[PDB]
Amino acid sequence: NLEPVSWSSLNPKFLSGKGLVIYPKIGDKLDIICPRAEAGRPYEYYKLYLVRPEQAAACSTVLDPNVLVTCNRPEQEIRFTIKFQEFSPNYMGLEFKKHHDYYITSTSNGSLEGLENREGGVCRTRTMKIIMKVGQ
Amino acid sequence: NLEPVSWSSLNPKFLSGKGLVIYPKIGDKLDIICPRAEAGRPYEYYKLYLVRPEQAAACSTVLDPNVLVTCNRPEQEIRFTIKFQEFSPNYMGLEFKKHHDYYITSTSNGSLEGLENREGGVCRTRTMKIIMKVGQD
Amino acid sequence: NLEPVSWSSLNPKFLSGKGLVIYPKIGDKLDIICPRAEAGRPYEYYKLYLVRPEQAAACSTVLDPNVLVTCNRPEQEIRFTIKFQEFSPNYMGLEFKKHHDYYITSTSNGSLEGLENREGGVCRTRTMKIIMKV
Amino acid sequence: KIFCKSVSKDPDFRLKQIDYVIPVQQDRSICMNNPLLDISDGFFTYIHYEGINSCKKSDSFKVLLSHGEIVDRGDYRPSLYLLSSHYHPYSMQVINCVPVTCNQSSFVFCHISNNTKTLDNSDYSSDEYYITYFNGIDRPKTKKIPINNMTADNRYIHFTFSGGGGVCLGEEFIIPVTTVINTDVFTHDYCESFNCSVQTGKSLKEICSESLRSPTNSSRYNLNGIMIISQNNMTDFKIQLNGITYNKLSFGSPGRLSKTLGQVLYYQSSMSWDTYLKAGFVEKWKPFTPNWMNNTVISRPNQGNCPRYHKCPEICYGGTYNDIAPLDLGKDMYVSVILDSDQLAENPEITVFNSTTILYKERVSKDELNTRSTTTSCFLFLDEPWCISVLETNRFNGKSIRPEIYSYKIPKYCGTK
Amino acid sequence: FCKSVSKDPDFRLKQIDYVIPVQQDRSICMNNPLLDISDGFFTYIHYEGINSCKKSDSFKVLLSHGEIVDRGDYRPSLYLLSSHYHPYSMQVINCVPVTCNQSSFVFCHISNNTKTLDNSDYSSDEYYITYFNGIDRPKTKKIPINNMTADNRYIHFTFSGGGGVCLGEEFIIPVTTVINTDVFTHDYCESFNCSVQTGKSLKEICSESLRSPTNSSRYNLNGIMIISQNNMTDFKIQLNGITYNKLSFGSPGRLSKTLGQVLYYQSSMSWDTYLKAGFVEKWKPFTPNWMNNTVISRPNQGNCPRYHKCPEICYGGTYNDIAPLDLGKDMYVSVILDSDQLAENPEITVFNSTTILYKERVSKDELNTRSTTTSCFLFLDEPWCISVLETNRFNGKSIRPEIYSYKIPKYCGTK
Ligand SMILES: *[C@@H]1O[C@H](CO)[C@@H](O[C@@H]2O[C@H](CO)[C@@H](O[C@@H]3O[C@H](CO)[C@@H](O)[C@H](O)[C@@H]3O)[C@H](O)[C@H]2NC(C)=O)[C@H](O)[C@H]1NC(C)=O
Ligand SMILES: *[C@@H]1O[C@H](CO)[C@@H](O[C@@H]2O[C@H](CO)[C@@H](O)[C@H](O)[C@H]2NC(C)=O)[C@H](O)[C@H]1NC(C)=O
Ligand SMILES: *[C@@H]1O[C@H](CO)[C@@H](O[C@@H]2O[C@H](CO)[C@@H](O)[C@H](O)[C@H]2NC(C)=O)[C@H](O)[C@H]1NC(C)=O
Ligand SMILES: *[C@@H]1O[C@H](CO)[C@@H](O[C@@H]2O[C@H](CO)[C@@H](O)[C@H](O)[C@H]2NC(C)=O)[C@H](O)[C@H]1NC(C)=O
Ligand SMILES: *[C@@H]1O[C@H](CO)[C@@H](O[C@@H]2O[C@H](CO)[C@@H](O)[C@H](O)[C@H]2NC(C)=O)[C@H](O)[C@H]1NC(C)=O
Ligand SMILES: *[C@@H]1O[C@H](CO)[C@@H](O[C@@H]2O[C@H](CO)[C@@H](O)[C@H](O)[C@H]2NC(C)=O)[C@H](O)[C@H]1NC(C)=O
Ligand SMILES: *[C@@H]1O[C@H](CO)[C@@H](O)[C@H](O)[C@H]1NC(C)=O
Ligand SMILES: *[C@@H]1O[C@H](CO)[C@@H](O)[C@H](O)[C@H]1NC(C)=O
Ligand SMILES: *[C@@H]1O[C@H](CO)[C@@H](O)[C@H](O)[C@H]1NC(C)=O
Ligand SMILES: *[C@@H]1O[C@H](CO)[C@@H](O)[C@H](O)[C@H]1NC(C)=O
Ligand SMILES: *[C@@H]1O[C@H](CO)[C@@H](O)[C@H](O)[C@H]1NC(C)=O
Ligand SMILES: *[C@@H]1O[C@H](CO)[C@@H](O)[C@H](O)[C@H]1NC(C)=O
């Protein structure tokens, strides 16, 4: 198991320049909680895409990136558990393997108006990208 | 009959350099008792290999050396009776004959973790090797 | 005399599974020529071990197996004559006698880098073993 | 008709793993994935894909096709005897295959294409479809299916054999297939009848129409169906393609047809919003109408907005394939290796269940085991009900991934351990 | 005849010395004898080697054909008729005798590699039938293993046993097969309530105990070979494996025609040190009705000596044929070794499934004996037996097996 990652604009683990770097070994669990209705009633709506390093640097996604998980409900604690095995019950396989890199980001505008804004968004403004270089 | 050889790391008959040499005649009995549960609870697990002089000197075994006897149970007094007759009930015949040499060793680590470690082990650290030159003196 | 056995990876007498078996009687000659410099200049470097059947199957040699003959020079046709007499001018005696088994192999990689490779080599890749039940 | 049919704990399935059927690759980069198994009349057909450093189906350089037999070894249990094993001649172009064991022989129905994404940008006239068939003695032979002389009940634009097995009825083969069509010709009374929270974006009629769309082609829809192939001893083929009933539609997904207990059972993997078991016996063939069960206890894990036990309509994609096998028709009993996890594909459990209650279950492994899909087939052996399941396992970490076969017996008595 | 527990039985034991040849070379060891008797004719086989008693390490293999003849002695005598050496003796891995239709038949496995069973396959080796009688010169025909059908994925095999059986036009020979995958179950072994070894579990212990001790990747499984033919023409060869019920590591077996039934014996070279034997119920799969014998075992060194019961990764044992005398009274006779670990003190033993009825030592002095074979038959309306013992009475000098003839005692306790 690993430390779950609360995915909100009010989370310190996202370094201002490097994002959130993780070095998970094979066979580890890792939760990615999208936040509940936060105390402050700031409805936080995101849409996460499994992406490649190049377009994660450019912070743009074409139609081919698959909507990994969407934080639709504000009240319900929607989540996304990860085990770094090869097989995943997700469309398009999403093989984790070993000695690879895995980047998770959101390009969305903070609210539901830009929920499906895929052009820019949080990927560069707040740099909320989870980068997982598995292995040493 | 001959004097049995207790096979434990606490046995003096294993000379620090020459091991334990025996000169038995044909038709002699000789037991090789692997020890019971010792007092101080030092569980002793070994696996004995009938070997050739060259790899008994080098203290390494390939797959062909036959597991002569293994000291599996710690409580039960496992043993191994030997008569130096020609015919033996062991796989691969194992004729004793006369004026031959017969070498017995173990490559095992002290505990069960390296029970089947065949690279080094007790053969060179403590030199617990039994060499049996049949003949008179 | 017997038919010499050319020792190269390019020899058909080495059956793909059974190696090369010979049934020589006592007092016969038998040469084992290690190859000259082949035409296409593919330098063939081996190191032959007189071995026992047990480690001949596993194709591994410890330090005690004696390097029977080594194919150092590529141009010079180095060879190895055998008479199946008892006495031989070799270190460690090498008594032939009769009704015995005698296995000769090489664990070497094709080239000089693995000349002294004793772990695997041609003994299992090409099964170039000479087995002699006299 | 003499086995445990009640709610009980600690069942004795007499579980044993079979390792000698599926080959073991020496190369660590090989992924053995997507296993399929179909048993019929004491013979089986096993299929799986092999790829290099990737376990994706069309990303496979070898596709193994195995034919075999069930044999008694005096073991008081059935044993798998592998008879023939061949590689597909067009493996590097295989998009999907479905096995059928007909008349004690193996038959493999495959779709071959130059484009691994052919279902998103092409049509079936641009691809080829083959039947590879063989047994224990004859060399495998592959014949091209004449899709030109095919009759269809609707304006389908594409199709692939997708499922865990097919069925032989007389001289006709019935293979599960997933079709692609680019116009909304469907109705959704069942989905539109749900009393769920209305999503602020779209209406329920829009949600239900769009949930049938391909997730990679907003203009295409994936609809399940069957293919009926009749022929005169591999001559003068007559091929028909019929779609599934519009009652309780679910997004196109690999299915299965099985001959069990004198009936024909259809299974559909739940890859959309209805995360509960889609299965049923076939009433009519045109349209392909399975009598859908009202199962309230069998589901499957998935990440995202539709995890295990999700019921409400939602534009979702993802899920796991988990075959079922009927045990008693009168008692409405079934067995299946399902995944005991809400979102992750792990912890396979042999589960004997009702339509309304789970009867008994057992984990396959004491350690955590990754399993993406399971298939199960049951049959009478020595006057007793026995079952064999195949799991696409990853027991070693990463590396050489390979499925596993397990054999087990339905417990004679309840609560024996 | 005597069917009760008693002492001092009168077997009228007599040794036969004129059958087995006497080699002039004192260094030669004559080892591994085999004997099969049928319809008053016998077939004897043994191996001859120089300063070594190993089977494949043999330069001569003797094959003898003979007849049972009455000499007016009120007991059977062995009459040696023909005696020849196998043409491929220096390449013989194993042979099995069968006396069919009053003639001798020898089924041998020949290979250039004495370790063929550890690193090769059966396509690389050859298998022959040598047959002859009292008048015809011996003829050797090669068995077409190419036209053989097998019930499983065997990679190698050798004729291994003390005898075979002739049924009509079919020969049934005991065989030990080789396979490179663990296709076996061990419900019988897994059912034992024994001390758990601290290293591995019982399922692992029982799986691994079927492996070859010299090739960790290989498994040795016993079975039979059925060879039917039209007067050495149009061979039909079938290879069937033994039942998975009560599996024991591959070992030399035997098939014998006795008392209207077919008895299979399997030497106990693993953890189950008690007698493995039984009559054949079905042929596919090869199912012998295993006996539940609690009194007959054999000596062996190592972790499985005499009377050892618990599953354990063991290898070793002695071959000791049995012969039924009366099936209803469940009586059997066998020359077993009365020692826990050493191969010595052979004893003719008439026994129950649950009790030993009576016994007698073969020699009053200690006698080394590596294996025994026994065959019984009706002679003068009485049950008589002939046994061959792989003896070593002259320690240090040459080795030669011994033949004994004896009668089941008519009355109990007569001396
Ligand atoms: C112990 O016994 C096993 C089986 O009895 C031996 O394993 C098998 O050995 C054979 C050769 O004797 C291997 O066959 C070769 O495999 C290569 C693989 O590419 C192939 O190219 C050759 O044409 C030939 O078929 C076989 O592969 C091997 N088993 C497996 C599963 O691969 C083993 O070598 C024996 N070991 C010792 C030390 O005796
Ligand atoms: C054992 O090895 C020898 C090695 O020569 C084999 O002898 C030759 O085998 C080939 C092909 O099998 C035949 O064409 C030759 O005729 C054989 N030699 C002679 C002199 O006839 C031999 O066949 C192998 N097997 C046996 C059983 O001997
Ligand atoms: C999504 O599917 C639609 C429907 O087929 C595709 O649109 C067709 O594309 C083909 C090939 O480019 C054209 O020949 C057709 O004229 C298009 N229209 C129709 C109605 O078929 C669309 O290209 C697909 N999206 C992709 C491939 O990204
Ligand atoms: C079995 O086959 C053998 C060999 O083919 C037969 O023996 C010979 O057959 C020929 C016929 O061409 C006769 O002329 C010979 O006299 C036969 N030899 C002997 C020694 O009789 C034999 O007849 C066949 N049938 C059997 C043995 O029953
Ligand atoms: C030794 O005990 C076993 C165990 O009961 C006996 O095996 C039975 O054999 C009969 C023979 O037809 C079968 O019907 C039974 O099914 C077997 N038992 C089981 C549990 O399956 C065996 O018969 C006994 N030995 C003898 C000589 O009878
Ligand atoms: C040997 O097995 C037989 C069964 O085949 C046992 O049979 C009877 O046991 C009683 C018990 O004392 C005896 O009185 C009988 O004489 C035995 N025989 C018969 C035909 O009934 C016998 O008990 C077993 N041997 C021993 C020593 O008990
Ligand atoms: C994000 O995009 C939407 C698209 O309509 C826009 O309305 C909104 O102002 C943008 N910025 C936000 C939500 O902060
Ligand atoms: C023996 O082998 C084990 C294998 O784990 C190793 O840990 C140990 O250090 C070795 N030596 C011992 C036990 O002396
Ligand atoms: C053989 O061994 C040598 C040892 O240095 C190695 O360099 C070489 O790559 C090996 N293989 C060959 C020569 O094919
Ligand atoms: C199966 O379902 C029926 C009703 O659907 C129910 O009455 C029965 O109790 C269930 N089975 C068990 C074992 O509870
Ligand atoms: C298979 O069996 C059915 C039985 O009805 C028969 O009609 C058919 O001709 C057989 N052969 C094939 C190829 O289906
Ligand atoms: C032996 O005799 C029987 C009948 O007498 C016959 O069927 C058989 O073919 C003969 N030959 C052999 C080898 O059994």
Q: Give the CA count within 13 Å in the CB-facing half-sphere of E184.
A: 34
Nearest by Cα to D268 from D190, D209, D322, D336: D322
Residue owning tokens 């594409």 = D158
Q: How far apart are CA E307 and CA E312, in angstroms?
A: 13
Residue D381 pairs with which residues in a beta bridge? D384
Q: Which residues contact D251 (CB under 8 A, 6 or more apart)?
A: D211, D212, D222, D271, D272, D317
List of chain C residues whose C-beta atoms are within 8 Å of the C-beta of residue B57: 64
DSSP 3-state of E65: strand
Q: Tell me A123's DSSP state.
A: H
Nearest by Cα to E273 from E306, E233, E321: E306
Residue E333 pairs with which residues in a beta bridge? E323, E350
Residue D71 tokens read as: 């044999």
Q: How far is the CA of D245 from the centre of ligand 7 (A)?
A: 42
CB contact B64 to C (< 8 Å): yes
Query: Which residues of E7-55 form beta strands (DSSP E)?
Result: 14-16, 28-38, 41-50
Establish whether chain D is in contact with chain B, requiring a minimum of 3 CB pairs below 8 angstroms: no
Distance from the first to the final alpha carbon of chain B? 17
Q: How far is the CA of E95 from the centre of ligand 4 (A)?
A: 27
Ligand 6 residue neighbourhood (C-beta within 6 Å): E 5, 329-330, 352, 354-355
Four-point Cα dihedral C83, C85, C87, C93, nearest 10 = 80
Query: Which residues of D135-277 form beta strands (DSSP E)?
Result: 141-144, 150-152, 158-161, 167-169, 172-181, 213-214, 217-230, 238-243, 255-260, 263-268
Question: From the candidates E198, E220, E269, E394, which should be mutated to test the interface with B, based on the most B CB atoms within 10 A?
Answer: E198
One-letter amino acid for residue D179 of the chain: T
Given E197, E303, E368, which is nearest B85 (Cβ)?
E368
Residue D186 tokens read as: 């469907």
What DSSP line would sit under C4-22, residue for residue?
----STT-TTSBTTTBEEE
Segments in E64-181 forming alpha helices (H): 116-119
Residue owning tokens 């499925």 = D403
Would you say D18 and D80 are in contact if contact means Cβ atoms under 8 Å apart? Answer: yes
Q: How far is the CA of C110 from the centre of ligand 2 (A)?
A: 28
List of chain E residues whose C-beta atoms are within 8 Å of the C-beta of residue C54: 115
Would you say E317 and E297 are in contact if contact means Cβ atoms under 8 Å apart? Answer: no
Q: How far apart are CA E236 and CA E254, in angstroms?
A: 22
DSSP 3-state of E391: strand
Query: Which residues of D231-342 form beta strands (DSSP E)?
Result: 238-243, 255-260, 263-268, 278-284, 289-292, 321-322, 325-328, 333-339
Please tell me the number of the ligand nearest to residue E129's CA.
12
Q: How far is the CA of A108 from the centre of ligand 7 (A)?
A: 9
Q: How far apart are CA E339 and CA E368, in angstroms?
A: 11
DSSP 3-state of A118: coil
Compute CA distances E219 → D353, E29, E157, E210, E319, whole Å.
40, 31, 11, 6, 20
Compute CA distances D185 → D180, D222, D274, D284, D285, whole Å.
12, 12, 21, 21, 19
Would you say E358 and E7 are in contact if contact means Cβ atoms under 8 Å apart? Answer: yes
Q: Is the dihedral of CA B35, B37, B41, B43 positive or negative?
A: positive
Q: Cβ–Cβ of D370/A90 closer than 8 Å?
A: no
| Neighbour count for residue D404 (Cβ, 10 Å) | 22
Q: How far apart are CA E248 and CA E246, in angstroms?
A: 7
DSSP 3-state of B26: coil
Q: Is the dihedral of CA E354, E355, E360, E363 positive or negative?
A: positive
Given D216, D304, D394, which is nearest A87 (Cβ)?
D394
Strand ordering across the sheet containing A129-133:
A20-22, A129-133, A101-106, A47-51, A67-70
Give the method used.
Answer: X-ray
Residue D36 pairs with which residues in a beta bridge? D47
- Is residue A75 classed exposed, middle or buried when 0-12, 13-18 and 19+ CB atoms within 10 A define those classes? exposed
Q: E317 in the Ramachandran plot: left (φ > 0), alpha (ψ -120 to 50) or beta?
A: left
One-letter amino acid for residue E36 of the chain: D
Q: Which residues contact B18 (CB under 8 A, 6 or more apart)?
A: B127
Q: How far is the CA of E228 from the centre of ligand 4 (A)?
A: 18
Distance from the first to the final alpha carbon of chain C? 14
Residue C43 tokens read as: 């330098």
Residue D38 pairs with which residues in a beta bridge? D45
Q: How would you label E214-246 residue by residue, b for 16+ Cβ within 10 Å and e otherwise?
A: bbeebbbbbbbbbbebeeeeebebbbbbbbbbb
Q: Which helix (H) or strand (E) holds D210?
A: helix D204-210
Q: How far apart are CA E226 and CA E166, in angstroms?
A: 10
Q: How far apart are CA D35 and CA D55, in angstroms?
A: 12
Residue owning tokens 């037999």 = D69
Ligand 9 residue neighbourhood (C-beta within 6 Å): C 109-111, 113-114, 117
Do β-strands D238-243 and D255-260 pair in parallel, antiparallel, or remain unpaired? Answer: unpaired
Residue E286 pairs with which residues in a beta bridge? E242
Q: Which residues contact B39 (CB under 8 A, 6 or more apart)?
A: none
Nearest by Cα to E106 from E90, E79, E83, E76: E83
Instruction: Count CB pairs under 8 A between chains C and E.
Output: 26
* Protein residue closest via CA to atom 12 of ligand 10: D6
Given C60, C63, C64, which is nearest B62 (Cβ)?
C60
DSSP 3-state of D43: strand
Compute CA distances E253 → D221, E175, E208, E222, whole Å.
66, 8, 21, 8
- Is residue E40 classed exposed, middle or buried when 0-12, 13-18 and 19+ CB atoms within 10 A define those classes? middle
Given D71, D75, D81, which is nearest E185 (Cβ)?
D75
Q: Domain spans of chain D?
A: 1-417
Would you say D13 and D348 are in contact if contact means Cβ atoms under 8 Å apart? Answer: no
Q: How far apart are CA E182 and CA E171, in angstroms?
A: 29
Nearest by Cα to C103 from C39, C49, C26: C49
Would you say D256 and D266 are in contact if contact means Cβ atoms under 8 Å apart? Answer: yes
Would you say D307 and D342 are in contact if contact means Cβ atoms under 8 Å apart? Answer: yes
One-letter amino acid for residue D413 of the chain: Y
Residues, chain C: 134
Segments in chain C forming alpha helices (H): 53-58, 122-125
Q: Cis peptide leading into A4, omega within 30 of 0?
A: no
The shortest C-alpha distance from D114 to chain A (Å) reads 19
Ligand 8 residue neighbourhood (C-beta within 6 Å): B 109-111, 113-114, 117
Q: How far apart are CA C8 and CA C44, in angstroms?
A: 7
Q: Which residues contact C71 (CB under 8 A, 6 or more apart)?
A: C7, C34, C35, C44, C45, C46, C47, C48, C78
Residue E349 pairs with which residues in a beta bridge? E334, E359
Q: How far apart are CA A79 and CA A73, in angstroms?
A: 11
Q: Which residue of chain D is at minimal alpha-carbon distance from E181?
A: D20
Q: How would you label D101-139 residue by residue, b for 16+ Cβ within 10 Å and e otherwise?
A: bbeebbbbbbbbbeeeebbeebebeebbbbbbbbbeeee
Q: Is the CB–ligand 1 distance for residue E27 below 6 Å?
A: no
* Protein residue closest via CA to atom 3 of ligand 11: D170
Q: How far apart are CA E165 and CA E283, in angstroms?
A: 13
Query: Which residues of D53-118 form beta strands (DSSP E)?
Result: 62-72, 78-87, 94-102, 105-112
Q: What is chain C's Cα-based Rg?
A: 14
Residue owning tokens 């990876």 = C9
Distance from the first to the final alpha carbon of chain E? 15
E111 Cα nearest atom in ligand 2: 27
Residue owning tokens 């397990």 = D406
Residue E376 pairs with which residues in a beta bridge? E385
Distance from the first to the final alpha carbon of chain A? 17
Would you say E8 and E398 are in contact if contact means Cβ atoms under 8 Å apart? Answer: no
Compute CA distances D73 → D323, E246, E262, E360, E383, whole Å.
27, 12, 20, 41, 37
Q: Where chain E is broken, by preceding residue (C–N > 2.5 Å)? A: none
Nearest by Cα to A82 from A65, A68, A63, A72: A68
Given C19, C21, C57, which is nearest E118 (Cβ)?
C57
DSSP 3-state of E231: coil
Q: How far apart are CA D341 and CA E47, in angstroms?
A: 65
CB contact B54 to C (< 8 Å): yes
DSSP 3-state of E15: strand
A113 Cα nearest atom in ligand 7: 3
Q: Cβ–Cβ of E215/B63 closer than 8 Å?
A: yes
Q: Tell me B113's DSSP state.
A: G
Q: How far apart are CA D163 and CA D37, in angstroms?
A: 10
* Protein residue closest via CA to atom 7 of ligand 10: D356
Q: Which residues contact E364 (CB under 8 A, 6 or more apart)?
A: none
The shortest C-alpha distance from D75 to chain E (Å) reads 5
Nearest by Cα to E333 from E346, E321, E345: E321
Q: How far is the CA of E136 from the centre of ligand 4 (A)?
A: 12
Do β-strands D404-409 and D16-18 pair in parallel, antiparallel, or remain unpaired? Answer: antiparallel
Establish whether chain C is in contact with chain A, requiring a minimum of 3 CB pairs below 8 angstroms: no
Q: Is the CB–ligand 7 distance for residue A11 below 6 Å?
A: no
> Resolution in A for the shown PDB structure?
4.1
In degrees and rounded to multiples of 5, residue D191 shows phi and psi of -65, -45
Distance from the first to the final alpha carbon of chain D? 21
List of chain B residues whose C-beta atoms are within 8 Å of the C-beta of residue C55: 62, 64
Instruction: Count CB pairs under 8 A between chains B and C.
Output: 18
Q: What is chain E's Cα-based Rg?
A: 20
Compute CA distances E312 → B72, E199, E316, whole Å.
9, 12, 12
Task: Let me know the angle formed at the C-alpha of E349 by E343 and E355, rounded to the nearest 5 degrees.
Answer: 110
Q: Which helix (H) or strand (E) holds E187?
A: helix E187-190
Compute CA distances C105 → A36, C73, D19, whole Å.
73, 19, 36
Residue A57 tokens read as: 């640097």
Residue D270 tokens read as: 């739940």
- Is residue C71 classed exposed, middle or buried when 0-12, 13-18 and 19+ CB atoms within 10 A define those classes? buried
Task: Let me know the angle formed at the C-alpha of B84 by B80 and B85, rounded to the nearest 5 degrees.
Answer: 115
Q: Tell me E330's DSSP state.
A: T
Establish whether chain C is in contact with chain D, requiring a minimum of 3 CB pairs below 8 angstroms: no
Would you say E27 and E407 are in contact if contact means Cβ atoms under 8 Å apart? Answer: no
Question: From the candidates B62, B107, B119, which should be mutated to test the interface with C, based on the most C CB atoms within 10 A?
Answer: B62
Residue D410 tokens read as: 């339905």
Ligand 2 mutation target, pool E56, E90, E93, E112, most atoms within 8 A of CB: E112
Q: Cβ–Cβ of A86/D317 closer than 8 Å?
A: no
Q: Is the CB–ligand 2 distance for residue E91 below 6 Å?
A: yes
* Protein residue closest via CA to atom 10 of ligand 12: E169
List of chain E residues whose C-beta atoms are within 8 Å of the C-beta of residue B70: 302-303, 313
Q: How far apart are CA E106 and CA E98, in angstroms?
A: 6
Q: How far apart are CA E414 and CA B61, in angstroms?
A: 56
- Is residue D331 classed exposed, middle or buried when 0-12, 13-18 and 19+ CB atoms within 10 A define those classes? middle
One-letter amino acid for residue E22 of the chain: V
